Design a protein around this nucleic acid. Structure first.
Lengths: 188, 260, 124, 153
RNA sequence: CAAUUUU
RNA sequence: CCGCCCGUCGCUAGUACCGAUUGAAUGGCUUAGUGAGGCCUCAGGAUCUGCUUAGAGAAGGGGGCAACUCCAUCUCAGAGCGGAGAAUUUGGACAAACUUGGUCAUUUAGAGGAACUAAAAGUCGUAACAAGGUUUCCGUAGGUGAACCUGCGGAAGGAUCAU
RNA sequence: CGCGGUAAUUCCAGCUCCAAUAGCGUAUAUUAAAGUUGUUGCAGUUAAAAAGCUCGUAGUUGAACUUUGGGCCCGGUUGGCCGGUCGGAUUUCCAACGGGGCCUUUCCUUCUGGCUAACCUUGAGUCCUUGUGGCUCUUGGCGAACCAGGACUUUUACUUUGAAAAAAUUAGAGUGUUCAAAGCAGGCGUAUUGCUCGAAUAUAUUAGCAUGGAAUAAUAGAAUAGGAC
RNA sequence: UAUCUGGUUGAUCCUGCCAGUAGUCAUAUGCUUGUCUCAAAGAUUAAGCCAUGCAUGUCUAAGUAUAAGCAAUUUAUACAGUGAAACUGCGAAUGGCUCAUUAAAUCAGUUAUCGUUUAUUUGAUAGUUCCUUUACUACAUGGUAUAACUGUGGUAAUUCUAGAGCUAAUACAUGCUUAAAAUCUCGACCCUUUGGAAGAGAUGUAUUUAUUAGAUAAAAAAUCAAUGUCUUCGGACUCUUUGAUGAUUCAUAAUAACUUUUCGAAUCGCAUGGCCUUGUGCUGGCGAUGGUUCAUUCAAAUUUCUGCCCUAUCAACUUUCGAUGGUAGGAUAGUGGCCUACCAUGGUUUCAACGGGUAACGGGGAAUAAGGGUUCGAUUCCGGAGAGGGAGCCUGAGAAACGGCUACC
RNA sequence: CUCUUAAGGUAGCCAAAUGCCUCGUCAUCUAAUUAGUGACGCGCAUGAAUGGAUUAACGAGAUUCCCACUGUCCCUAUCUA
């Protein structure tokens, strides 16, 4: 029932706009969904024109990718730690974009050891041939291996949770996990 | 508002249908067209305004519901249906066969042709597109789309559809030395064959054009349409021949119909 | 509903009620032709108005002009088709200088009296 | 109007759908996505070596100059990344066979690859409706004024 | 030096 | 010039304006409240309908010599784990409606007050038009039955274009 | 404006006459008449109107000057001396110009290419009227005579042209709707398969768009030279 | 078809008004009325109230026929022609009325979607579905559980309808069956190391994320390394692929994963034919129906520029109830202060912003006329709005619908 | 114009704390109003430094009405010292 055009909302001077022509259907905007955790109640809706979108509630698992290899494996989603705009969804466990989450980190080192074999971090007929081939890049980065030391990883988040259901982000890689920790710790 | 219009009055229709003003009532409007806006014409108004093979309304449906008139082969079960530019409608055999090409003035046509040369269209690309599966097609302008054209040449050029399937049989390049045929506007359907390859680059397109008798008339791109080559033309035309014989020449040329 | 249908006036009264000669110069004409009503003497002047409405504006424009050599050659023909302009003065300037109340003596009240038959125009 | 640690606020400004691989190190390190918009509008080079993001820049953001091209001179500069242009035009009323000159001063989005004082005879394009009222973006500054780096009295 | 009215 | 004409005062019909009432109503915008409904949403789980393990409240009967109860044996299911789910309820958002005031805008009621208009033109005077009998007009001040008068400083539209 | 106070050319009536005509009067707004709202086009001594004078930013209004001339060269429009008659063609040139391109210091952008091209390129070859005089394979070569990219350009005001200004509305061309206001019909034979022209055209401001024009105006480009080349 | 005349005075000239004068496709009234074609008509004030009726329903060759309906009777003992009532399907969002609100709002002209949705019309368009990949059995075809109906109720009510007996599908939820190659993931055998493969899995389409390509102004040696075909065996050379825009992270293909799994005929009509291996063998035409996507069309929604009557006895207006911008989030079909969190303090304006009034819906146009203009347009066409006054909302491709629903007045 | 002792209440204001007749008359206030307020003046007997008229603030000054509050009251009851 929330309108979203500007036949209300006083214009660039200050003129109290003549508001009229009773509100219509091509004008709509719905209640914010506030997706949560708690095992998959993603409730389907109709939309305009003959359409069908996905407003999630209580999701727990979504494929999070690296992606310079493109792994995209399903991971257990655990807890939001920092949202860049709204400091209430960190405390009410809602998630949208850049509400970057700790997850589980375990379905990655089953894949990581599967052809690298570091191991981190304290034989088939071509086992060395499938390990010497994609070798000489066994180091990843200092601050990324040292998060597998605790064994739970910070994923970023990219898909829109309450408009397509799935929260489908990426492994927060690069120096961006040397960026959010400055915005993480400095809440003072 | 609240949805599409579906009723259309007289004295609100296009005037180039040359439709009547004073019957006291509404007008034909087409369905969802294949090709154009109502710069097409319904095939209702073709056979009681210009052909006069009927004389009142639903007797157009009486011929139409009984397999008589073939349009591009198919009977075209919708009684009002757009018969736009270039299209071939055909009746029974022995020379009842037509084609829909503009004259000079603004009427559409009465263009009696044979069953031969009515075995192929001559279209125009609006857009080329390489759609799904990585496989290219093209979009000709009568609503159709044809698959695997004679490839890697053009946008904005003619094509020769062949009334069986897709069938690129002759694409003819957008040349200076050419026979072009402008479709629409105040300069609708004369002929001006070319003069020059303008683009007016960046913003918007326009093409300078000269006629047979050296009256340069200059048109928009969206009106202009290639149809042949100098002296050649593929689709033949009626007795008007595209001159725009003006009124101070209309005065004494019409002095030959009295017989006295 | 229905598309509109036009209807016009066909005369134009003078802006003067009472002049002591034109209310008799009409009757120097009214007995001269046997006309029943001065609506008609306004009606034939309405053409003599609108002919010279149509003729002065074709002449303030130039020689060799794409309406004057079409319509100024065409307007003279339709009124010599009746024959009220003479068969020598086709140059559209004796159309502006057309005779006063000259259209109405080729009304066939007095085109049937010139073939005898009445011994009046009141009989016409 | 900001610089000096471009990622100054609490969200991380970086271009969508671009990425630099953390594996092998080279000298360029950020494949920035730039382009040209057409109508003979050739980009300034300060767009390249600069490291701003600001999603509604015309050469880097996901917009394109689409409609018409206007002109005018700039009045204000006191906002974060927006300025207002000034226009002068003459409306003719046929009752008097005379003119009169009006004005309308629309706002227009600015790109940090440029730089503008007040003055600055400038030309703008048309964009997607990027904000509340500002719908145009400056596309070529043509910085032209008298007494520029010239006063020494 | 001082002077009012004439339906 | 026995010309005209000015004001008060009286006689009659009018028209606006001011007006105590904490005037009144209508419309709009806002102070703080109450807030029906519908939608979303945290819940709830009457009420149905299935499948499976298989007893029982019973035979479904592989035809066995008595078997295993193969089966479902009406429905308690001993269970499971569903699935559709109302009556109500939970927290948002939109919010009709109403009060409360303040502020505007539009119309109206008023006891009464002073103005002006029109007017058989009456009473009191003569102000003006002539040097109108004190030259007339303007600004300001004072006075008085009423025109009017007196100062004061101008101007001639004056009764002088003149030492 | 005035008539009527027992002589009414106005009242009330008769007879006559006059207007307009199946229409006429009355009332109310509004247009012209209104040069009584005035841009084209007003007055400013009591007449109605010039501030008591002066300063003053907007708003208007703003002196003059920069490619003129001169010559060359081409084809167009109108009309001729030309009808020469079957009021139709101009064989030659002329008359008044208007359109375009050169030269006088005076180009009318520049570079990348592919073209293209004129060949003054010309190695040379061809019926004849004498080997770019009528023709051919090819080079330093009469290149934005055509595309698509560059140096990318002081900016406008103004003005011609042009697709653009829905249909009806208006001026209208054509048509024997009986004429007409209308409407877009109709017309011609063979009236026995039988033909056929039709339904235009036009202003339609300003705002946009394209192109031609460079007078009239504004507008910027060098001065401690950081000036183009 | 550019015109003037009576009134101040004893008579004159002149401003100035009053009056006369013609027209109104502009209203009313009065008197009067014989004929032909063309017809405006409860706009004005009361967007004030309404008795009564009518104004939106629909079926083919093609969705279901147990009507104890109607004819039938000979091609149909599965009906075999229709066809009430009905369930599906579509439409009822169009048309029609009126002009109250509404003065940069609507609207007129001109643009944009590289910022979006689309039932319908027309054209392109599906061998990759199994998850114990021979137990997954119907693919020679599986299950509803409800109608209409049949019979019994209440209430006076109305287009209210109850438990019970059955029942269909293009309604519902399911569920399979068809050609080979190609690469990738593993690894039975390598035990040799310059290599091969049994077998197993995916392989269509949609979804959403992250990533890759989608190139194109001249040339040449040297460097180090993976480094090849052939072998004159030092040696020649790997021929290198590109659609469009003025412009894109564009179309498109690819990598890696998902999905309460998106789709991939369990549908009807007519004619009955072709190989003999005479068997429900195998193979076929022509016609509707619905689908996913890309187009088109009918649209809709936004948005650029410029244009609207009077008033200063309205000069400052708008922001703690977003006013002006930015970074993020949501929400939107779709861009955006649309909404939120925060950060900054803007924006408009004597060229008339803000405010007030309209006996203002805007435009196409009307009347009148020498030219310039004035005053109108409720309304025959285009667009907008409302259905007593405000709000909500289901279905639907399309509605804040009102001859649809709910609440309040 | 006149009389009494000389002059005859001008500006203003009022049933006012000054009006006997009087609970004057009109309006508004109220359900009802000898109260209150605003007007009328021929005022027994107001009225000009015996000062007249209007006043912002300040009244433990005197009055009337409204809102909030409440055992003053309907209707009394209970407890403590």
């Amino acid at each position: 029932g929330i309108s979203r055009d500007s036949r209300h909302k006083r214009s660039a001077t200050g003129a109290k706009r003549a508001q009229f022509r009773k509100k219509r259907k091509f004008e709509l905007g719905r209640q914010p969904a506030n997706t949560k955790i708690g095992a998959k109640r993603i409730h389907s809706v109709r939309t305009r024109g003959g359409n069908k979108k996905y407003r999630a509630l209580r999701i727990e698992t979504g494929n999070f990718s690296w992606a310079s290899e493109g792994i995209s494996k399903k991971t257990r989603i655990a807890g939001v730690v920092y949202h860049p705009s709204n400091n209430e969804l960190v405390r009410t466990n809602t998630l949208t974009k850049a509400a970057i989450v700790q997850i589980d980190a375990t379905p990655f080192r089953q894949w990581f050891e599967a052809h690298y074999g570091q191991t981190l971090g304290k034989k088939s007929k071509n086992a060395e041939r499938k390990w010497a081939a994609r070798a000489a890049s066994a180091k990843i980065e200092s601050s990324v291996e040292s998060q597998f030391s605790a064994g739970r990883l910070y994923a970023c988040i990219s898909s829109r949770p309450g408009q397509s259901g799935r929260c489908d982000g990426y492994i927060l890689e690069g120096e961006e996990l040397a960026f959010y920790l400055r915005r993480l710790t400095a809440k003072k | 508002a609240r949805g599409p219009k579906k009723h259309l009055k007289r004295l609100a229709a296009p005037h180039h249908w040359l439709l009547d003003k004073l019957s006291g009532c509404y007008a034909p409007r087409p369905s969802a067209g294949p090709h154009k806006l109502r710069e097409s014409l319904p095939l209702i108004v073709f056979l009681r305004n210009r052909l006069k093979y009927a004389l009142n309304g639903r007797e157009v449906k009486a011929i139409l519901m009984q397999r008589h008139v073939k349009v591009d082969g198919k009977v075209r079960t919708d009684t009002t249906y757009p018969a736009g530019f270039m299209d071939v409608i055909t009746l029974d055999a022995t020379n009842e066969n037509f084609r829909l090409v503009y004259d000079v003035k603004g009427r559409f046509a009465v263009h009696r042709i044979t069953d031969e040369e009515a075995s192929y269209k001559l279209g125009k690309v609006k857009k080329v597109q390489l759609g799904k599966k990585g496989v290219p097609y093209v979009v000709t302008h009568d609503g159709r789309t044809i698959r695997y054209p004679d490839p890697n040449i053009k946008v904005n050029d003619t094509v020769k559809i062949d009334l069986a399937s897709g069938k690129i049989t002759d694409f003819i390049k957008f040349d200076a030395g050419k026979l072009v045929y402008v479709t629409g506007g105040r300069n609708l359907g004369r002929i001006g064959t070319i003069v020059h390859k303008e683009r007016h680059d960046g913003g918007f397109d326009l093409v300078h054009i000269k006629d047979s008798l050296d009256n340069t008339f200059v048109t928009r791109l969206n009106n202009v349409f290639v149809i042949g080559e100098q002296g050649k033309p593929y689709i033949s035309l009626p007795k008007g021949k595209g001159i725009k014989l003006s009124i101070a020449e209309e005065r004494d040329r019409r002095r030959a119909q009295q017989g006295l | 509903p229905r598309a509109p249908r036009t209807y016009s006036k066909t005369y134009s009264t003078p802006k003067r009620p009472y002049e002591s000669s034109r209310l008799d110069a009409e009757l120097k004409l009214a007995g001269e032709f046997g006309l029943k009503n001065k609506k008609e003497i306004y009606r034939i002047s309405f053409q003599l108005s609108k002919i010279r409405r149509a003729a002065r504006d074709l002449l303030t424009r130039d020689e060799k002009d794409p309406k004057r050599l079409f319509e100024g050659n065409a307007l003279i023909r339709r009124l010599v088709r009746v024959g009220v302009l003479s068969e020598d003065k086709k140059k559209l300037d004796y159309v502006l200088a057309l005779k006063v109340e000259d259209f109405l003596e080729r009304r066939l009240q007095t085109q049937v009296y010139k073939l005898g038959l009445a011994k009046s125009v009141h009989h016409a | 109007s900001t610089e000096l640690t471009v990622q100054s606020e609490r969200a991380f400004q970086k271009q969508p759908h671009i990425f630099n691989n953390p594996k092998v190190k080279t000298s360029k390190r950020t494949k920035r996505w730039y382009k040209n918009a057409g109508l003979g509008f050739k980009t300034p080079k300060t767009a390249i070596e600069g490291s701003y993001i600001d999603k509604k820049c015309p050469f880097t953001g996901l917009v394109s100059i689409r409609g018409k091209i206007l002109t005018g001179t700039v009045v204000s500069t006191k906002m974060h990344r927006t300025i207002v242009i000034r226009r002068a035009y003459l409306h003719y009323i046929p009752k008097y066979n005379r003119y009169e000159k009006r004005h309308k001063n629309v706002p227009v989005h600015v790109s940090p690859a440029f730089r503008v004082q007040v003055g600055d005879i400038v030309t703008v394009g048309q964009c997607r409706p990027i904000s509340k009222t500002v719908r145009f973006n400056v596309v070529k500054v043509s910085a032209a004024a008298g007494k520029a780096n010239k006063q020494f009295a």
